[PDB]
Design a protein around this ligand. Structure first.
Ligand SMILES: [Mg+2]
Ligand SMILES: [Mg+2]
Ligand SMILES: [Mg+2]
Ligand SMILES: [Mg+2]
Ligand SMILES: [Mg+2]
Ligand SMILES: [Mg+2]
Ligand SMILES: [Mg+2]
Ligand SMILES: [Mg+2]
Ligand SMILES: [Mg+2]
Ligand SMILES: [Mg+2]
Ligand SMILES: [Mg+2]
Ligand SMILES: [Mg+2]
Ligand SMILES: [Mg+2]
Ligand SMILES: [Mg+2]
Ligand SMILES: [Mg+2]
Ligand SMILES: [Mg+2]
Ligand SMILES: [Mg+2]
Ligand SMILES: [Mg+2]
Ligand SMILES: [Mg+2]
Ligand SMILES: [Mg+2]
Ligand SMILES: [Mg+2]
Ligand SMILES: [Mg+2]
Ligand SMILES: [Mg+2]
Ligand SMILES: [Mg+2]
Ligand SMILES: [Mg+2]
Ligand SMILES: [Mg+2]
Ligand SMILES: [Mg+2]
Ligand SMILES: [Mg+2]
Ligand SMILES: [Mg+2]
Ligand SMILES: [Mg+2]
Ligand SMILES: [Mg+2]
Ligand SMILES: [Mg+2]
Ligand SMILES: [Mg+2]
Ligand SMILES: [Mg+2]
Ligand SMILES: [Mg+2]
Ligand SMILES: [Mg+2]
Ligand SMILES: [Mg+2]
Ligand SMILES: [Mg+2]
Lengths: 141, 149, 151, 262, 129
RNA sequence: ACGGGGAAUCAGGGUUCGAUUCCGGAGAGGGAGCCUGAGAAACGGCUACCACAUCCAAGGAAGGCAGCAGGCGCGCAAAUU
RNA sequence: UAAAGUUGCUGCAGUUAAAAAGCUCGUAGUUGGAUCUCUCUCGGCCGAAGCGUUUACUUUGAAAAAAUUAGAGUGUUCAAAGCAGGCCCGAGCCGCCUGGAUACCGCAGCUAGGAAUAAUGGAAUAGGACCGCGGUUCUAUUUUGUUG
């Protein structure tokens, strides 16, 4: 069992400090490898340049073609696959455009049928996708 | 349980509640002390002296009769060994095991038992150093052990 | 003779030992008057300091030091430097979270005056604070009490 | 810093000045003088906040430059002059005299005194030393140095000084049974009789005081100022005689006063 | 080896209480055990007990009344200030209408309420309810 | 990772934060050396090297916004010359 | 951050769901069986001096920046705030009354009582306590009205 002596504070504290490293989330947050590997580098959003448009096949048992864009970030130059979520919003994005990209909602984990996609497009050409979808603002042009 | 064995025996002695000398015992304190001195001069450890007194002279407990223990009586008289009897027996047993082991190199059990005996010797030596019975430089060494006892 | 071991002459600065006198008083005894002082706080001057002949400018009784500050205690652990020893102070540090304690220790280099002799490893020493005598020494030995095993 | 500091933040000012937070960023830093920065009351604070004579700092300067205010009988034009315990402030234009005495709350009080009383003050002996040619010198709590004092006067005693000539008239010895006021700590502003003194060599001494009502407390030796011999003070006391009330009895007194008002 | 005697005595008493026994034999004896039993008996939880005196550490025979739900010991003996007593009361006692925490103070061995009356702290030994 | 006074969440324990108006420390692009003065190794003082950089009649002269506004750049990210 | 008693000191698990070292010895660390109910002298009952074998613990007391938090008072029209305000006027033409509390501030360091619990201490080769009595050596002050 555990030691219950009156002078065992050092042992208890040292053991807890050493056994906190077997927690997945504590080690992920305090090790530094995840932060280094994160393309955003800890930011909530990022800006990138749309390299191209791609279609990702939805994982089984669902069957569909999810429209995504390959983009390259401006601050570090990494390449990222982002999702354009709406019905027909892929026609609002042109190549070589500048887009704002945020996370998908699961802190770096893939969401839904889309395999290996953890980012989504928020604004394209400095206007929000919601405004374009609802017809409140037009593309600058 | 045992210090170096899994056994958990219960065999021991139970002294009677009464501390008074029995009426039939005719011996006085001085006579018992003289018997103790004669036995010690004969070359007997205090344990053997107590065994002899119990078996032959009807002396159930010397501390009840003379008011003192055998070792303290010997120390007061001056007929006391330099090192305690239990440590002497442990060192003698270690010497015997080591003498056996040198002619039998493949007896791993003897090596295990020798390690246990030497651990007990170290424990007892440290305890006796704490009580200043031994000088704070006395050391048990295998070579010196034969001359020690 | 035995005192004079350095390249410079070892003298007590506040004692004038060249006072001339008649030839009758020279024959009697060449006994220099000793300089000593009471350090206060109830500590008594060891007889070896008053009757001794050693020279030590850092001695609390016959030297030019002042005892003011904290009075602490320790156990003698090492005696290998010249006129200075190393003592150890043990204590317990409290950890609020676990409601328990942990054992901790500190080491102090303190100055030992020649008046204190027969000091062994493992006896209790009461030291007092003074001005920095060296890089690491800030305390001076005031009292020495023997261990429990004294005969 | 590379040298002396010349400003004082308003929130970092002593709390017995009772300054408000939203008036400004700075507070009047007291000038160097007889009293410590943390234990004095600047002239401007007493002149505009306590007495309401001036509304701004400019009006305090306009009053001071007319040479109307006197501290210990001498005209001071400095508006940040450090005025401290047992000091006399005279305004001849309005014919008013005040003495700076702590109240039971530990704040300097507006205590008016008779012009006859305004001619002397009490001082605490801080140092006794013999100077050149074997002349004794006595140093008080307010930086006054007096030559040739009475041989019986020692430290921690009280001397009465005539402000006109600056000479000792008489003195009170520090003995049990005398009247004392606490000038610092948690018991600041309390008045009582000394009961006993505890001596700790190499450390601070502790003195026990008991007030008129029988409440007992203790302080350090440096926080005690002997006011009078026995139960009779040598100065006039403020509205409160130095007895500190508890919160419950302060509430009771306030409610009784409200009930009798109207 | 046996390192706490009060713990063994309290465990024996609790086990015998669960089984519906009328008397309990606890050995070895100790004056701390006697004080704890006296504190329990003053509140009517156990009843009269007798100390059998052999020439080595003694034994105790305790009568049971069936009113004891739980008696236990706290190890290690934690220092308890008078302002931290309510937390121990909340953690260890079942309700605020019954139950007692046993403390050893400089005045003696008593319950938490008697220590509140005498305005003193100490070290926690155990509890019973 | 500037440190505390403190902040968020919290049955009782506890976890996380504190560049930021108060108190201490350090720095003035990076180092180093000084004059004056009670007090500075000061930079809205000086003298050099290192990196940038302004005018020039090519001989020379003059630099330090992590002070208030303001400008470029950087970025998801922050105001009136 | 809580939810997470999924980092468990309070307060988690280790036969089969993840898990106890192949076995033994052993230093450091942690833990450890019962027992034991103020003082002479010198000065004015108290004052000085030694206390306590010492601690740990608990209860006091002193010193402990403001601001924030908790909290008392106060109709910022309420509130978040602030430290302000109230009363009679025949007008006080010397205007009157009153606040600007208190609580907390860990650890370490000071202070005074408690004596349970937990450490440590004494007289065993008696060169151990207490009351006395002779022998020897080394220095200081006072009295022989002063001075050697
Ligand atoms: Mg995983
Ligand atoms: Mg599924
Ligand atoms: Mg489907
Ligand atoms: Mg074992
Ligand atoms: Mg057997
Ligand atoms: Mg806790
Ligand atoms: Mg500055
Ligand atoms: Mg000023
Ligand atoms: Mg930090
Ligand atoms: Mg940094
Ligand atoms: Mg909480
Ligand atoms: Mg909770
Ligand atoms: Mg901060
Ligand atoms: Mg900070
Ligand atoms: Mg930073
Ligand atoms: Mg600087
Ligand atoms: Mg700069
Ligand atoms: Mg810059
Ligand atoms: Mg530069
Ligand atoms: Mg100057
Ligand atoms: Mg510079
Ligand atoms: Mg500048
Ligand atoms: Mg500057
Ligand atoms: Mg700017
Ligand atoms: Mg500019
Ligand atoms: Mg913003
Ligand atoms: Mg911008
Ligand atoms: Mg959490
Ligand atoms: Mg919970
Ligand atoms: Mg988890
Ligand atoms: Mg619980
Ligand atoms: Mg689990
Ligand atoms: Mg398994
Ligand atoms: Mg196994
Ligand atoms: Mg061990
Ligand atoms: Mg025990
Ligand atoms: Mg503070
Ligand atoms: Mg505060």
């Amino acid at each position: 069992g555990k030691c219950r002596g009156l002078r065992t504070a050092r042992k208890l504290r040292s053991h807890r400090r050493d056994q906190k490293w077997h927690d997945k989330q504590y080690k992920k947050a305090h090790l530094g490898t995840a932060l280094k590997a994160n393309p955003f580098g800890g930011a909530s959003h990022a800006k990138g340049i749309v390299l191209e448009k791609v279609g990702v096949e939805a994982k089984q048992p669902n069957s569909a073609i999810r429209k995504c864009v390959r983009v390259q970030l401006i601050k570090n130059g990494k390449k990222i696959t982002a999702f354009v979520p709406n019905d027909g919003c892929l026609n609002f994005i042109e190549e070589n455009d500048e887009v704002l990209v945020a996370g998908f909602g699961r802190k770096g984990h893939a969401v839904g049928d889309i395999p290996g996609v953890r980012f989504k497009v928020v604004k394209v050409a400095n206007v929000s996708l919601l405004a374009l979808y609802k017809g409140k603002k037009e593309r600058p042009r | 349980g045992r210090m170096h064995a899994p056994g958990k025996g219960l065999s021991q002695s139970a002294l009677p509640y009464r501390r008074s000398v029995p009426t039939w015992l005719k011996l006085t304190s001085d006579d018992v002390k003289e018997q103790i001195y004669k036995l010690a001069k004969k070359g007997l450890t205090p344990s053997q002296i107590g065994v002899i007194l119990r078996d032959s002279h009807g002396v159930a407990q010397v501390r009840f009769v003379t008011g003192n223990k055998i070792l303290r009586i010997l120390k007061s008289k001056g007929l006391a060994p330099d090192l305690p009897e239990d440590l002497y027996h442990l060192i003698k047993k270690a010497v015997a095991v080591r003498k056996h082991l040198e002619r039998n190199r493949k007896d791993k059990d003897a090596k295990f038992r020798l390690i246990l005996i030497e651990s007990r010797i170290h424990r007892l030596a440290r305890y006796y150093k704490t009580k200043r019975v031994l000088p704070p430089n006395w050391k048990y060494e295998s070579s010196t052990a034969s001359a020690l006892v | 003779a035995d005192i004079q071991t350095e390249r410079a002459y070892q003298k007590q600065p506040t004692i004038f030992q060249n006072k001339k006198r008649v030839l009758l008083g020279e024959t009697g005894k060449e006994k220099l008057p000793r300089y000593y002082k009471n350090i206060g706080l109830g500590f008594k001057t060891p007889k070896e300091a008053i009757e001794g002949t050693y020279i030590d400018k850092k001695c609390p009784f016959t030297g030019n030091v002042s005892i003011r500050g904290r009075i602490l205690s320790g156990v003698v652990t090492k005696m290998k430097m010249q006129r200075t020893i190393v003592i150890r102070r043990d204590y317990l540090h409290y950890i609020r979270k676990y409601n328990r304690f942990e054992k901790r220790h500190k080491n102090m280099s303190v100055h030992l005056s020649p008046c204190f002799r027969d000091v062994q490893i493992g006896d209790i020493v009461t030291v007092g604070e003074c001005r920095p005598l060296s890089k690491t020494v800030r305390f001076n030995v005031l009292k020495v009490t023997k261990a429990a095993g004294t005969k | 810093a590379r040298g002396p500091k010349k400003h004082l933040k308003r929130v970092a000012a002593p709390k017995h000045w009772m300054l408000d937070k939203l008036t400004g960023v700075f507070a009047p830093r007291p000038s160097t003088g007889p009293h410590k920065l943390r234990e004095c009351l600047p002239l401007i604070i007493f002149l505009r906040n306590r007495l309401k004579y001036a509304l701004t700092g400019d009006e305090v300067k306009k009053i001071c430059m007319q040479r109307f205010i006197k501290i210990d009988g001498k005209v001071r034009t400095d508006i940040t002059y450090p005025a401290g315990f047992m000091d006399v402030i005279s305004i001849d234009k309005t014919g008013e005299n005040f003495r700076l005495i702590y109240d039971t709350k530990g704040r300097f009080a507006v205590h008016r005194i008779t012009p006859e009383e305004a001619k002397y003050k009490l001082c605490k002996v801080r140092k006794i030393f013999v100077g050149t040619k074997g002349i004794p010198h006595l140093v008080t709590h307010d930086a006054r140095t007096i030559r040739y004092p009475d041989p019986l006067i020692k430290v921690n005693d009280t001397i009465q000084i005539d402000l006109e000539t600056g000479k000792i008239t008489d003195f009170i010895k520090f003995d049990t049974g005398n009247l004392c006021m606490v000038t610092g700590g948690a018991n600041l502003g309390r008045i009582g009789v000394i009961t006993n003194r505890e001596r700790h060599p190499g450390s601070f001494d502790v003195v026990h005081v008991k007030d008129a009502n029988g409440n007992s407390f203790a302080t350090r030796l440096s926080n005690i100022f002997v006011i009078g011999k026995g139960n009779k003070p040598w100065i006039s006391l403020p509205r409160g005689k130095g007895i500190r009330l508890t919160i419950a009895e302060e509430r009771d007194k306030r409610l009784a006063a409200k009930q009798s008002s109207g | 080896v046996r390192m706490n005697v009060l713990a063994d005595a309290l465990k024996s008493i609790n086990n015998a209480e669960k089984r519906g026994k009328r008397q309990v034999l606890i050995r070895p004896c100790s004056k701390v055990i006697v004080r704890f039993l006296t504190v329990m008996m003053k509140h009517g939880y156990i009843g009269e007990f007798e100390i059998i005196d052999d020439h080595r550490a003694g034994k105790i025979v305790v009568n049971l009344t069936g009113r004891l739900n739980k008696c236990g010991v706290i190890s290690p003996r934690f220092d308890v200030q008078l302002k931290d007593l309510e937390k121990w009361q909340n953690n260890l006692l079942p309700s605020r209408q019954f139950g007692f925490i046993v403390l050893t103070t400089s005045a003696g061995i008593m319950d938490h309420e008697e220590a509140r009356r005498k305005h003193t702290g100490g070290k926690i030994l155990g509890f019973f309810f």
